[PDB]
Amino acid sequence: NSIQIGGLFPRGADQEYSAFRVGMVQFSTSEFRLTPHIDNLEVANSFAVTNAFCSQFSRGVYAIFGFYDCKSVNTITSFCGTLHVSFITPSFPTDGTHPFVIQMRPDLKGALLSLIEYYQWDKFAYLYDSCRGLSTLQAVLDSAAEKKWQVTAINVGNINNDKKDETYRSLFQDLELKKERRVILDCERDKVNDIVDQVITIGKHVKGYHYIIANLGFTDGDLLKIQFGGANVSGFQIVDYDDSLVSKFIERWSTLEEKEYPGAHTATIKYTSALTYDAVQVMTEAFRNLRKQRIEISRDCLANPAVPWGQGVEIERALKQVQVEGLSGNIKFDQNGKRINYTINIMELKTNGPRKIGYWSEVDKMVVT
Amino acid sequence: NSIQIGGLFPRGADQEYSAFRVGMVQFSTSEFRLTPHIDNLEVANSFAVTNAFCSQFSRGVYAIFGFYDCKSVNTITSFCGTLHVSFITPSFPTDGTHPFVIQMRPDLKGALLSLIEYYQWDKFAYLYDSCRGLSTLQAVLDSAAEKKWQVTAINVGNINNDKKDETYRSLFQDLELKKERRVILDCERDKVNDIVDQVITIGKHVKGYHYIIANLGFTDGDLLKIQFGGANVSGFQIVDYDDSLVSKFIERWSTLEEKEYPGAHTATIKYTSALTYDAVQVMTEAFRNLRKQRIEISRDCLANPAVPWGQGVEIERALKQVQVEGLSGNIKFDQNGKRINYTINIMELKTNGPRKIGYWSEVDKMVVT
Ligand SMILES: *[C@@H]1O[C@H](CO)[C@@H](O)[C@H](O)[C@H]1NC(C)=O
Ligand SMILES: *[C@@H]1O[C@H](CO)[C@@H](O)[C@H](O)[C@H]1NC(C)=O
Ligand SMILES: *[C@@H]1O[C@H](CO)[C@@H](O)[C@H](O)[C@H]1NC(C)=O
Ligand SMILES: *[C@@H]1O[C@H](CO)[C@@H](O)[C@H](O)[C@H]1NC(C)=O
């Protein structure tokens, strides 16, 4: 008895797909196997996403694993909720409550505000790039009001075509309007590189900067290849390499072959990819526990009725009731498919590389060394 | 020769639909008539919007008139651009460039920043409610950085269920953490009422507040029915009642019958509704000028190919090339379907009612009396 699922992958998310195939192997059994059907697509494109989702709906699928972007998230949330098909995703978690959405990624906002407190910052910059940026920004601004922080929040993303000395050094005239040194960067890695390169070209106070990078993959590959010119650099990490699961997993990961398993074979793995492998565990567990109650039951998105609410909700609740350890640590979901009981490691870039200075917990706030 | 169009109306946008039927009459001729097919729907619902749009696409339509919301705007922009069907809309204009979208509504951000300057504000609050709020907020924050304004930006919308003294008076503890009196309100009218009512209950400095209401209908009906307790209250207005078109139009508007023309019969008209009537002019003009070059040509959104790009783009350009005077004044569109050469009247609430203290122009910044 194989269970059919969707896979919505962004074009060129090779590592993530590789992690998926791996997880597929690792948590398959005699008892059953998940059979995925994969679309690769421009996830920013809402028409593209609608169309792939419908295609999957009409094959009949028990769940969809997949990704969204700022532009497409409402398409997913709406089609999920309308059609009672569960979507599991490493993508950014939505502010709101949204049924039929299992959110593999934990929420950084908590940690980010705690970190801001810990470093005793009260006058700083926030450079945002996209809805992910905004949504965290908002939480910050709401607290800025409450703790009287002085935030200079700027939208680095909203630059037409290239961003130059003309824009970025224009930006550092605005930032050197208050001698601003503490900086939060919530942008794609290229922007981080491009912004930081500008601090360097300008050539004043380069080592004096303290950057916080607001994502969960500090020690994924490409970030720490940026020349930060010796500034203090902090960040976050959900895949802890001192864990047994992870080190075990990484032994296998680094010895696979790129030709067969593209983006594999590295010391580390992108959180999106780890969350993907974790997702596969979460899915198989919930179908396992669905079989423990002896349930199955059975398998055009615009004309034909939705999956009956009662059938759909039992799959949703199975997914949300799962509790496991995987690469992202303790996987557990609240009523809304948001992760709970998770911890996020706080990281600083020291001479000898990136070092955990502490963790943050959902149950508890920042804890040291 | 009748031309077929879509009408996507939000459920309970009666005035707007009434304005549409009126405009339909007013700018119909022997030469041709537009035949609209109407869906009424939850425009916040992306699945609802997709489905109505597809339904229209598959009837074959030369254009769609309609509305979107924060949640649905990307569905419209994506399906428009994918399918080469022009969408005309009084809804909030998008930051970006988006093909096949004709944006009837002018952009307030310009005026809002100019107004903020004129009043020589440099420490103030911004209470936002939704993407419309955010997108303007962003423009403000970007300039705040540049002019060293001290903005306390708070998300009044993101309150679970009811907002109380517990939230709103919690909010006025955060706002009386800097004796904040200058306030920008970018929220639905109920929030405006609810926020202002709280200033009143608190009962300190009530007349000392200065509110700016960030929308284009100051002198639409319901806003000025709020008890502002004698504070300075400013705002914006695109329908100028001293114009001839408008006064002529209003003579007719107030003498129609509610039973036949619901939300009609009032002294004033909501900008969304005026922009609707203006839209109808814009559409008929562009089909008129399409007939001047002797063009027609001819009439499942997920399987079947799009409207051929070359057919579609000639309708788009016709719409964008239109220039007319209607209720919103000088209607003219740039390359991206954004309004240009528009003016926005600046308004203050005085004892003797709302009075134009000045206008702002796209060509020029704030001008007095
Ligand atoms: C950067 O890190 C060093 C190392 O502890 C610290 O002494 C310094 O104060 C930090 N810079 C700022 C601006 O806090
Ligand atoms: C939290 O996670 C730890 C290990 O990560 C686990 O032992 C514990 O049961 C979890 N707590 C809850 C409330 O599930
Ligand atoms: C409110 O308007 C009055 C009328 O001109 C003005 O004198 C006063 O300064 C305004 N209040 C503020 C806080 O600017
Ligand atoms: C601007 O609008 C005025 C009247 O509203 C009109 O006379 C003028 O032609 C317009 N300017 C441009 C550049 O179209």
Report the relative pairing of strands A353-361 and A210-213 from DSSP bridges.
Answer: unpaired
Three-state DSSP at A365 gives: coil
B82 close to B306: Cβ distance less than 8 angstroms: yes
- Closest by Cα among B64, B66, B68 to B44: B68
Ligand 4 mutation pick, B325, B330, B345, max ligand atoms within 8 A of CB: B330
Local structure of residue A92 (DSSP, 8 states): P
Q: Check for a shared fold between A1-106+242-341 and A107-241+342-369.
A: yes
- As a whole number of angstroms, the distance between CA B248 and CA B16 comes to 18
Domain ranges of chain A: 1-106+242-341, 107-241+342-369
Q: Measure in Å the smallest separation between the Cα of A12 and chain B Cα atoms.
A: 21
Q: Is the dihedral of CA A35, A11, A69, A51 positive or negative?
A: negative
A272 close to A13: Cβ distance less than 8 angstroms: yes
Three-state DSSP at A262 gives: coil
- As a whole number of angstroms, the distance between CA A13 and CA A269 comes to 12
Q: Gap positions in chain A, given as the residue before each gap (C–N > 2.5 A)?
A: 299
Q: Is the dihedral of CA A141, A145, A146, A150 positive or negative?
A: positive
Task: Determine phi and psi for B237, rounding to 5 degrees.
Answer: -155, 125
CA distances from A252 to A22, A238, A261, A357, B131 (A): 10, 20, 12, 28, 45
CATH for B107-241+342-369, among 3.40.50.2300, 3.40.50.720, 3.40.1170.10, 3.10.20.30? 3.40.50.2300
The residue with tokens 């050469």 is B341
Find the helix packing angle between B131-147 and A131-147, rounded to 10°. Answer: 60
Question: CB distance B145–A155 less than 8 Å?
Answer: no
- Closest by Cα among A177, A227, A226, A176 to A205: A176
| CA R_g for chain A | 21
∠A286-A290-A291 over CA atoms, to 5°?
120
Find the helix packing angle between B309-321 and B271-292, rounded to 10°. Answer: 120
- Closest by Cα among B221, B274, B213, B285 to B249: B274
- What is the position in ligand 3's atom list of the atom closest to the CA of B182? 13
CA distances from A136 to A95, A111, A129 (A): 9, 11, 11
Q: What is the dihedral of CA A220, A225, A229, A231, to 10 degrees?
A: 0
Q: Using a CB-CB distance cutoff of 8 angstroms, which residues of chain A are in contact with residue B152?
A: 144-145
Who among B51, B146, B153 is closest to A141 (CB)? B153
B151 close to B125: Cβ distance less than 8 angstroms: yes
- As a whole number of angstroms, the distance between CA A253 and CA A277 comes to 12
The residue whose C-alpha atom lies closest to atom 14 belonging to ligand 1 is A210
Q: Using a CB-CB distance cutoff of 8 angstroms, which residues of chain A are in contact with residue B47?
A: 78-79, 82-83
Instruction: Identify the experimental approach.
Output: X-ray
The verdict on the CB of residue A339 being under 6 Å from ligand 2 is no
- What tokens appear for A133 in the block? 């940026």
Q: Measure in Å the smallest separation between the Cα of B155 and chain A Cα atoms.
A: 7
- As a whole number of angstroms, the distance between CA A122 and CA B361 comes to 39
Which long-range contacts (C-beta less than 8 Å, at least 24 apart) are formed by A360-369? A360/A110, A360/A111, A360/A114, A360/A115, A362/A106, A362/A110, A365/A110, A365/A114, A366/A111, A366/A114, A366/A115, A366/A117, A366/A118
Distance B282 CA to ligand 4 centre (A): 16
- Closest by Cα among B18, B76, B31 to B266: B18
Could you give the strand order of the β-sheet that contains B3-10, starting from the edge strand earlier in sequence? B34-41, B3-10, B63-66, B86-89, B101-103
A88 close to A64: Cβ distance less than 8 angstroms: yes
Q: Using a CB-CB distance cutoff of 8 angstroms, which residues of chain A are in contact with residue B145?
A: 152-154, 174-175, 177
Size of chain A, expressed as the number of residues it contains? 369
Report the relative pairing of strands B232-237 and B343-350 from DSSP bridges.
Answer: antiparallel
Q: Name the fold adopted by A1-106+242-341.
A: Rossmann fold (3.40.50)
Other C-beta atoms lying within 10 Å of the C-beta of residue A311: 16
Consecutive H or E run containing A283: helix A271-292
Cis previous bond, A315, omega within 30: no
Cis previous bond, A76, omega within 30: no
Q: Gap positions in chain B, given as the residue before each gap (C–N > 2.5 A)?
A: 299
CA distances from A328 to A24, A68, A105, A209, B9 (A): 17, 20, 9, 30, 45
Who among A74, A79, A83 is closest to B71 (CB)? A74
Contacts of A30 (CB under 8 A, 6+ apart): none
Three-state DSSP at A77 gives: helix
A329 close to A243: Cβ distance less than 8 angstroms: yes
The verdict on the CB of residue B330 being under 6 Å from ligand 4 is yes
Find the helix packing angle between A14-26 and A271-292, rounded to 10°. Answer: 30
- Closest by Cα among B194, B57, B317, B267 to A50: B57
Q: Using a CB-CB distance cutoff of 8 angstroms, which residues of chain B are in contact with residue A95?
A: 158
Other C-beta atoms lying within 10 Å of the C-beta of residue A201: 12
- As a whole number of angstroms, the distance between CA B338 and CA B97 comes to 9
CA distances from A180 to A36, A46, A125, B178 (A): 50, 38, 7, 22
Contacts of A179 (CB under 8 A, 6+ apart): none
Other C-beta atoms lying within 10 Å of the C-beta of residue B368: 8
Burial of residue B330 (CB within 10 Å: 0-12, 13-18, 19+) is middle
In a 13 Å sphere around the CA of A78, the CA atoms on its Cβ side amount to 26
Burial of residue A190 (CB within 10 Å: 0-12, 13-18, 19+) is exposed
Which long-range contacts (C-beta less than 8 Å, at least 24 apart) are formed by A302-305? A302/A54, A302/B50, A302/B51, A302/B54, A302/B302, A304/A58
- As a whole number of angstroms, the distance between CA B19 and CA B256 comes to 11
The residue with tokens 């109505």 is B52
- As a whole number of angstroms, the distance between CA A247 and CA A270 comes to 14
| Amino acid at residue number B254 | S
- Closest by Cα among B55, B96, B57 to B73: B96
Q: What is the 3-state secondary structure (H, E, C) of chain B?
A: CCEEEEEEEECCCHHHHHHHHHHHHHCCCCCCCEEEEEEEECCCCHHHHHHHHHHHHHHCCCEEEECCCCCCHHHHHHHHHHHCCEEEECCCCCCCCCCCEEECCCCCHHHHHHHHHHCCCCEEEEEECCHHHHHHHHHHHHHHHHHCCEEEEEECCCCCCCCCHHHHHHHHHHHCCCCCCEEEEECCHHHHHHHHHHHHHHCCCHHHCEEEECCCECCCCCCCCCCCCCCEEEEEECCCCCCHHHHHHHHHHHCCCCCCCCCCCCCCCCHHHHHHHHHHHHHHHHHHHHHHCCCCCCCCCCCCCCCCHHHHHHHHHHHHHCEEEECCEEEEECCCCCECCCEEEEEEEECCEEEEEEEEECCCCCEEC
Which long-range contacts (C-beta less than 8 Å, at least 24 apart) are formed by A16-19? A16/A67, A16/A90, A16/A263, A16/A270, A16/A272, A16/A273, A16/A276, A17/A262, A17/A276, A18/A256, A18/A261, A18/A262, A18/A263, A18/A264, A18/A273, A19/A269, A19/A273, A19/A274, A19/A276, A19/A277
Size of chain B, expressed as the number of residues it contains? 369
- As a whole number of angstroms, the distance between CA A104 and CA A277 comes to 10
- As a whole number of angstroms, the distance between CA B69 and CA B46 comes to 9
Beta strands in A268-342 (DSSP E): 323-326, 329-332
- As a whole number of angstroms, the distance between CA A337 and CA A315 comes to 12
Consecutive H or E run containing A366: none
- Closest by Cα among A236, A241, A231, A242 to A351: A231
B324 close to B285: Cβ distance less than 8 angstroms: yes
The residue with tokens 């499942």 is B300
Who among A74, A138, A145 is closest to B46 (CB)? A74
- As a whole number of angstroms, the distance between CA A338 and CA A326 comes to 16
Which long-range contacts (C-beta less than 8 Å, at least 24 apart) are formed by B241-250? B241/B268, B243/B327, B243/B329, B245/B325, B245/B326, B245/B327, B246/B327, B249/B277, B249/B327
- As a whole number of angstroms, the distance between CA B362 and CA B188 comes to 26
